[PDB]
Amino acid sequence: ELDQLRQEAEQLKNQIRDARKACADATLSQITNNIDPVGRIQMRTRRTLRGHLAKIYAMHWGTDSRLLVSASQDGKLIIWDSYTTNKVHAIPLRSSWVMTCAYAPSGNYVACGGLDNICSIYNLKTREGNVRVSRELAGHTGYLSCCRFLDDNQIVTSSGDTTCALWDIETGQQTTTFTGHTGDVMSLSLAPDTRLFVSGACDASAKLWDVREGMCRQTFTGHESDINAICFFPNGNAFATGSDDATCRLFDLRADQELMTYSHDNIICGITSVSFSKSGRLLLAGYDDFNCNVWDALKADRAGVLAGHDNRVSCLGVTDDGMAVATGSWDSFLKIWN
Amino acid sequence: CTLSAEDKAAVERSKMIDRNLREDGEKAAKEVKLLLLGAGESGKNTIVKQMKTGIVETHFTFKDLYFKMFDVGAQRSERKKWIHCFEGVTAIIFCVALSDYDLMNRMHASMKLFDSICNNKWFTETSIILFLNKKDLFEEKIKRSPLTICYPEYTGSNTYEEAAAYIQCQFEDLNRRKDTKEIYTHFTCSTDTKNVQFVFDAVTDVIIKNNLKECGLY
C-alpha cells in the first residue's frame, strides 16, 4: 500500500514541476534591463546607542518611527527614543536566554521569548507608573524563534518543534496550529493586509499560510541549507529569503516560482537578517563577516556596504516613513544610519 | 541651553537609569557559570541532588563563592542552533556511567557525544570536568563479565584497577587541544562532599588565568 502512495506522490510532484516550467517564458533580468542603475549608495552613522553589557539578539521599530525596543543576553529589555539618545524604559527579564522581541502597533505592549519556551506580554501604560507583565503563553514544546502582533488581542509565534501557532491573549489559549514543516522553523513575516503569512525553516523550504482557514497554500524550494530570514515585498505579491549557503533569493506568489538570486564569490559566510526599502528598490542584508550589504532589487548588483561593527550583525530594521536604518550586533552596540 | 524644562527632566531620568544598569553589571561579573551535559542514565541527578520548560537552573554558595548551574537535557531539538549561547561559561561538567558498557552499546554513544562537545569551535579554551560514576556496580559486574565486549584490544586483567585506567585513557585520547585546556578527571564518591571541593579547586585556576590576562602580565 505504501509503495503505491509513494508513486502517487512522485507523480504529483512531476505534474507540479511541469506546470511551473510551462509558465516560465522570460526572466526578470531580460525584462529589467536597459534601465539606469541606482548608482553608488553611501550612508553614515548618525547615532550610537550604548548601555547593553552583552550580545544583542533582536530589535523592532515602533510605528511612529521614533521609538524602538532591543533585547540582549543580559536579562534586560530597553526602549530607546532615537532623536535624543534617551532611555524611556528598562525592563528586567525573568529568564536570561531571550531570542526575539516585538512592538505592538498601538504602542501599548511588548512581547519577548526564548529557551524557556514561553511568550511574555508586557503592559507599558499603567496607573501605578511601572511596567508589569500581563500574560504568559505556555503551549510550545520547543524554543521560541519569532513573534508578531496582529492587534492588541492576537499574536502569532514560531518554535523549534516545527510548528507555528495563533493565540488569543485574553483567554491564553491557542486558536489555530500550523503543522506542515519537518525542520525547525526559524522566522515569520506578516503580509501588509494581515490575511496571510510566510515562514522559513531548517528543512530549506518556505510555506505560505492562511490565517482564517489554517491551511498551507504553497511551498517554495531552492535553497541548499537552513533558511534564517524572510521578508515581504511592499505591495504584498513577493518575498525574499536568506540562508546559510551565502545566498539570497526572490519568490513571486502569482507565478509560484523563483525570480532572482543575490550572491557573490567573495562572500562565503551565512546571512542573518534581510529587509526592503520604502519603494522596494533596495534589499539590505546582514552577514556573519561583520558587515551589511546593499543590493539593487531589480538588478543583481552590489550598491554599497555598511562597515561599522566589530562582531556579527545579528539584527536590522527599516522605519515606516523610510528615513533611517538600524543595525544591532554581538559587540553590544546599536547604530542608526542614513 | 536650547532645551526646555521637560527636556531636562527627561535627561535626568535617563542618567538615573544608566547608573542602575552599571551596578547590575558589576554584580553579575563575579558569578561562576557552569554547564551540565550528559547522556541519559549517567548519574546527573545524583550530582544535582548532592549540590544544593526548556532549561533548569540551580544556584548555591560554597566557601564565599557563588555558583549557577544550567541543565539543557530536555531541549530535544537541533543543538547547533542554540549551542553558541553558552560561549563564555567558566567550565563544563560531563557525566559518564561506568556500569553502562555491557548494555550500539551506550558507551560508544557517550564517547561520540564527548568527542563532539570537546572539539567544538565555540569551546576552544574551556576546561572540562569529567565525572565517572557508579564505581560500585562496575566493580561487581566486571568480575562476571569481561571488558572485551566493549573493547576488543584490551589485554589487561579483568579487575577494577586496570579497567578504570584503560577507560580514563580512552576518554582522554579524544582531546585534540591539549595546550589551551585541561581535562580534570574524577571518580565520583557518593557519600562525601569531595565533589564540590574538586570543582572549587578546578575553577580557582581559571580565575587566576583570567586575572593574569586582565592585568596585562600575560
Epitope: 521609538l67 527614543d81 534617551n86 524611556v88 496607573r127 501605578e128 507608573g129 511601572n130 | 536650547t2 526646555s4 524644562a5 521637560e6 527636556d7 527632566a9 527627561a10 535626568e12 531620568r13 538615573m16
Partner: single-chain antibody, 232 residues
C-alpha cells in the same frame, strides 16, 4: 492612588510649622513632587518643586529663604518646613505628582489639601472673562492668552487646562494644548496659536459647572491665569 496630607491649623505670627503628605498605591520613587496653594478667595499659586532622586529643587521668589522641601522615599513621605510665618500665608495647600519622559502627562493627580490660618521677567497669563451664563445642551468656548509665545523650537506648545468643581480638588483636562487626559469624555477639545488659546465644550452637561484655569510650563516659575467661572 491616594495622597493624604496633614498639618495646618491656627498659627501665631513669627512661628514655624511643618506639613506632611503620605502616598500610597503607586511607585512613589519615580515621581517628582510639587506644592501649590490657594488663598481664601483667590486663584492658584505655585510654591515648590522637588525632582525624582532629589537632584533638583526649585522655590518661588515670594517664599525663598523661609521654606524647605524634603522627601523620604522608604517611608513614602513628603515634607514642607515653614518658618517666620506672615499674614499672607493663610491658604489651602495641595500636593501634586508629576512624571517626565517622552509622551507622559504631568500634573495628573492632586490631593485633598490642608488649611493653614495665620492669626492677626515672568510670563503673564490673562483670562478676560468671568461668570459666563449657560444652559445644559449648548456649546461653549473659553479663551486664554499670554504675554509670550509658548511654542518651542522642538515643536511643542506648553499650555495646560484644569477644572475645579465646587468643593473639590482640581482635575487635569488637557495637557500640552491639544491632548486629552485619561478618563475624560470626548466633548472637550483644545486649540490655539502661538499666543492665543481656546477650550471648546461641544454639549454642556450639569456636572461641568465650576472654574477653569490655564497654566504654562515653558519656564520656572510656573504661572497660573485667573479663573473663569461657569454659572447656571
Amino acid at each position: 492612588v491616594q495622597l493624604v496630607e496633614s498639618g495646618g491649623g491656627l498659627v501665631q505670627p513669627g512661628g514655624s510649622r511643618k506639613l506632611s503628605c503620605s502616598a500610597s498605591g503607586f511607585a512613589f520613587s519615580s515621581f517628582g513632587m510639587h506644592w501649590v496653594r490657594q488663598a481664601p478667595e483667590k486663584g492658584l499659586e505655585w510654591v515648590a518643586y522637588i525632582s525624582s532622586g532629589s537632584g533638583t529643587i526649585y522655590y518661588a521668589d515670594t517664599v525663598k529663604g523661609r521654606f524647605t522641601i524634603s522627601r523620604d522615599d522608604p517611608k513614602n513621605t513628603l515634607f514642607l518646613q515653614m518658618t517666620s510665618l506672615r499674614s499672607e500665608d493663610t491658604a489651602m495647600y495641595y500636593c501634586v505628582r508629576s512624571i517626565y519622559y517622552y509622551g507622559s502627562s504631568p500634573f495628573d493627580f492632586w490631593g485633598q489639601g490642608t488649611t493653614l490660618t495665620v492669626s492677626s521677567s515672568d510670563i503673564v497669563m490673562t483670562q478676560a472673562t468671568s461668570s459666563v451664563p449657560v444652559t445644559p445642551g449648548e456649546s461653549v468656548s473659553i479663551s486664554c492668552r499670554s504675554s509670550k509665545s509658548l511654542l518651542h523650537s522642538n515643536g511643542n506648545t506648553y499650555l495646560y487646562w484644569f477644572l475645579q468643581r465646587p468643593g473639590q480638588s482640581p482635575q487635569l483636562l488637557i495637557y500640552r494644548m491639544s491632548n486629552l487626559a485619561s478618563g475624560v469624555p470626548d466633548r472637550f477639545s483644545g486649540s490655539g496659536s502661538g499666543t492665543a488659546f481656546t477650550l471648546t465644550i461641544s454639549r454642556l452637561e450639569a456636572e461641568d459647572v465650576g472654574v477653569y484655569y490655564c497654566m504654562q510650563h515653558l519656564e520656572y516659575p510656573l504661572t497660573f491665569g485667573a479663573g473663569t467661572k461657569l454659572e447656571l
